[PDB]
């Protein structure tokens, strides 16, 4: 109550507000929620943090439906320290093409724009950095990784900079593909940040304490060595090559909740251990009369999000279900309740495939209903992740199926040049007439913003990924793609980085095992030229 320095979080009460609460309670600060303008008075107010995700006018809306403009601006006025996180970022600026008819703040008098998807996944998911300048703030450095994960942004250009710099605002650049965009920006008392700095381990730890201690450290001074190792060589558009731990949450027989077939503190402590080892991701595969509320799924995720600083995916169990009492809860708050619990992506799998052949049907076009479709409306598509489970089928020619297929190096049985992968769903046990190429396609035209490419057959072997699986469907969305099933060694990884346009690599069994950690992996990347994180607490 005075025991420790306040610290202000405005809440609209939407998304994952676990991370940056524990982040400031981690730094030893007490968090006071602001979910409405009579929680908080201009004088009493000494730091002041503005978060948000999802869609623009979803948070906007939303912030200036409660009352918070005047307070905010009131605030701002003060002259006392603001920090703007993401979407808290965005509503500083005239408003987002995301959300044509939402204002903003309008600090900044241009409007975010979406990346160009014609050269590069949009949206961007990943560990971007700083591009060096002289006018960096609050720690950010250059050689260091923050996560970033949004389809729009401040993209900039000479004009806009320049304009920026004689208005006596200090930017921090980031660049992804050949588009400039706004990292972060400081003005006098406002400072604020386009990465999830609460998502950033460490590095963004640090950027956090350096706001709320208002101080803006020197960055370390760097051997002309780590600076040409640790610098962004723009390969992979800029990201590093983002390595992703998973893990299974089962339910035994006494009721608790494990990881492995026969032994809630197992997940949660394995979450913790991947975090520990470098995983820049990771990702909880929910396979467990229990009402929505006490799903022990959301205690594992809101507990694992008391110390992981890195972004937390759930699949299995987003979608439309009917609670203990008959109470119909659909897809979209199912979502919510897991992303207010700690999660920040939902990973979508049976519904995808009812999505897609929906899709078709429909002559390529989605009626709204779709999980994909309310989720990504809300949240945005970086919310969501499709998890495919395809199975290769050979064909004589294209003659042969409805499905698309491509030329394979690997010939079939009878001598089949051609195959297309069919997609499963219900736990890989019921096959579609959906190809995967169909299948992501649609997802992403849905509103999909990334695609968990599991490889079935290829699960268990830790002989490495499905190649061309991996480059057929490169070839047919334009969202991210994450290589899994397959991996056992770091090799493996170093195969689909260099081999295939995989956009990240996750790996399940390899970790659990303790085989390899994801430091391992990560090691063996860097020594071989590869960008990855390098942040530890
Ligand atoms: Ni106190």
């Not at 060595?225 to 060589?233: F, G, Q, S, T, V």
């Not at 439309?320 to 199912?334: F, N, Q, R, S």
């Not at 061309?468 to 969305?477: F, S």
């Not at 090799?491 to 996750?506: N, V």
Request: some cysteine.
């Amino acid at each position: 109550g005075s025991h420790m320095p306040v610290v202000h979080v405005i809440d609209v009460e939407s998304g994952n507000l676990q991370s940056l609460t524990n982040a400031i309670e981690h730094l030893g600060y007490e968090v006071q929620l602001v979910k409405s303008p009579k929680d908080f008075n201009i004088s009493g107010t000494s730091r002041l943090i503005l978060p948000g995700v999802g869609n623009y006018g979803h948070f906007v809306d939303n912030l200036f439906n409660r009352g918070f403009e005047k307070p905010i601006r009131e605030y701002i006025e003060s002259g006392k320290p603001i920090m703007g996180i993401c979407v808290g970022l965005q509503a500083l600026f005239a408003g987002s093409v995301e959300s044509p008819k939402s204002t903003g703040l309008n600090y900044i008098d241009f409007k975010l724009s979406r990346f160009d998807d014609s050269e590069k996944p949009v949206p961007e998911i990943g560990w971007n950095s700083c591009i060096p300048s002289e006018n960096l703030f609050f720690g950010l450095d250059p050689y260091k990784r923050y996560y970033f994960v949004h389809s729009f942004a401040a993209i900039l250009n000479s004009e806009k900079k320049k304009n920026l710099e004689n208005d006596g605002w200090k930017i921090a650049k980031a660049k992804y593909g050949s588009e400039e965009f706004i990292a972060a920006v400081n003005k006098n008392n406002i400072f604020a940040t386009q990465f999830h700095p609460e998502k950033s381990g460490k590095a963004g730890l640090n950027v956090i304490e350096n706001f709320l201690k208002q101080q803006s450290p020197p960055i370390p001074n760097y051997s002309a060595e780590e600076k040409e190792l640790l610098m962004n060589d723009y390969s992979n558009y800029g990201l590093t090559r983002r390595i992703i731990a998973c893990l299974d949450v089962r339910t035994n027989d006494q009721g608790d909740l494990v990881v492995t077939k026969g032994d809630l503190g197992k997940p949660v402590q394995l979450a913790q251990k991947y975090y520990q080892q470098g995983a820049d991701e990771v990702t909880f595969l929910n396979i467990t009369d229990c009402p929505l509320k006490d799903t022990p799924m959301l205690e594992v995720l809101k507990q694992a999000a008391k110390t992981v600083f890195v972004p937390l995916t759930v699949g299995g169990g987003i979608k439309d279900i009917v609670d203990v009492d008959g109470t119909k809860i659909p897809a979209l708050e199912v979502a919510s309740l897991y992303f207010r619990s700690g999660a920040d992506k939902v990973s979508i799998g049976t519904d995808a495939v009812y999505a897609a052949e929906k899709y078709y049907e429909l002559g390529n076009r989605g009626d709204g209903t779709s999980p994909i479709e309310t989720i990504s409306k809300a949240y945005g598509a970086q919310a969501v992740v499709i998890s495919v489970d395809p199975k290769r089928v050979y064909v004589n020619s294209q003659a042969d199926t409805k499905n698309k297929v491509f030329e394979t190096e690997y010939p079939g049985p009878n001598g089949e040049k051609y195959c297309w992968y069919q997609c499963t769903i219900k736990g890989g046990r019921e096959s579609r007439d959906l190809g995967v190429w169909e299948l992501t396609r649609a997802c992403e035209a849905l509103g999909a913003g990334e695609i968990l490419l599991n490889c079935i057959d290829k699960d268990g072997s830790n002989s490495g990924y499905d190649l061309e699986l991996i480059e057929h469907v490169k070839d047919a969305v334009k969202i991210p793609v994450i290589a899994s099933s397959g991996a056992g060694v770091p090799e493996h990884f170093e195969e689909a980085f260099l081999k295939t346009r995989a956009d990240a690599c996750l790996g399940a069994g390899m970790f659990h095992r303790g085989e390899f950690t994801v430091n391992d992996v990560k090691e063996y990347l860097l020594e071989h030229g590869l960008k990855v994180r390098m942040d530890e607490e």
